[PDB]
Amino acid sequence: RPALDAILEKVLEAVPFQLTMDGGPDAARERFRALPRREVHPELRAEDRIVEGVPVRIYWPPESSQTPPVLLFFHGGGWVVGDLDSYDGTARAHAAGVGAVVVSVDYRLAPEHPYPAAVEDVWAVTRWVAAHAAELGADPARIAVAGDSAGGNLAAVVALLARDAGVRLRAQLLWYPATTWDTSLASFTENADAPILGRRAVGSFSTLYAADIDLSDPPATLVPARAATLAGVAPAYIAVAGYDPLRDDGIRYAELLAADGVPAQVHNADTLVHGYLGYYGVVPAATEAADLALAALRGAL
């Protein structure tokens, strides 16, 4: 309804990127790895570790008098592409903005390891941090989960696993996630041919991740919106994008949570596209929208 952001549109014309399966997974991962990215907060301490067999990268916030909270970050990329390096900047932005130790999880990727491999990896690291976070200098009593796109789906699913296993999450930050698999929502039609993610790509990556799941009654670990109840999971901030086919997905997920009594905040950056964290520190409207969600999560921790 409001126009696509003017700076965003100049950026999208200089480097037009489309998330698609074209050329196979290796070409797709290469197109995503090759996008030019601004380095964000490079001073921050980072370390590589392996946690319960899952490769991880750990970031520390600016050292302060207080012991920081810990946040698990689940990168996006349609459950197929993405890695610690192309998300390095995004993880650092979370670390500085939330003031938290951030654990970026390098989960297994489809199609080589389809559903539920990603869930097992992000969950294993979430279990490990909830018990061993002080070993990093973080407060294990202050934990949250964050994820974008496919990683937003992983973050919403991990919060249900955490509620049922007794892991206390104080918040879940969902950047433009894929929680419902409802293609009938309005944004899938309004934004079917949108700049970063279209409706074909949404359907393609779901099939590569979980081709053999009957979606008439799928498990909640695939579609978090289909859980018996969403009551009891950590409060939600859902950052949604106007020109994204998944916009109404996140907004619907906010409605289902509130109907189950869950504290839920949804913000719609109506002038932005899917994956606007990739423009952090580049597209001003993207940094501002990102900084809002980062601030709310700073308070809840």
* CATH code (residue 64): 3.40.50.1820
> Cα 158–159–163 angle (5° rounding)?
115
Counting every residue written for the chain, the total comes to 301
Burial of residue 111 (CB within 10 Å: 0-12, 13-18, 19+) is middle
DSSP E strands in the chain: the ranges are: 46-51, 54-59, 70-74, 101-105, 143-148, 171-175, 236-241, 264-269
CB 174 within 8 A of CB 230: no
Measure the CA–CA gap between 101 and 88, rounded to whole angstroms: 14
Q: Where are the alpha helices (DSSP H) in 74-232?
A: 88-98, 117-132, 150-165, 186-190, 199-210
How many domains does the chain contain in total? Answer: 1
DSSP 225: G
> How many Cβ atoms are within 10 Å of 27's Cβ, its own excluded?
13
Measure the CA–CA gap between 92 and 90, rounded to whole angstroms: 5
Resolution in A: 2.5
143-148 vs 101-105, strand pairing mode: unpaired
Which residues neighbour 281 within 8 Å (Cβ) at sequence distance 6 or greater? 38, 40, 89, 93, 287
Kindly provide the b/e burial profile for residues 143-163, where b requires at least 16 CB atoms within 10 angstroms of the residue's own CB. bbbbbbbbbbbbbbbbbbbbb
From the list 86, 149, 187, 206, the catalytic residue is 149
Burial of residue 70 (CB within 10 Å: 0-12, 13-18, 19+) is buried
- Residue 14: both structure tokens together: 């200089």
Measure the CA–CA gap between 90 and 40, rounded to whole angstroms: 7
Measure the CA–CA gap between 167 and 158, rounded to whole angstroms: 10
Burial of residue 190 (CB within 10 Å: 0-12, 13-18, 19+) is middle
149 is catalytic: yes
Host domain of residue 50: 1-301
- From the CA atom positions of the chain, what is the Rg in Å? 18
Measure the CA–CA gap between 200 and 31, rounded to whole angstroms: 18
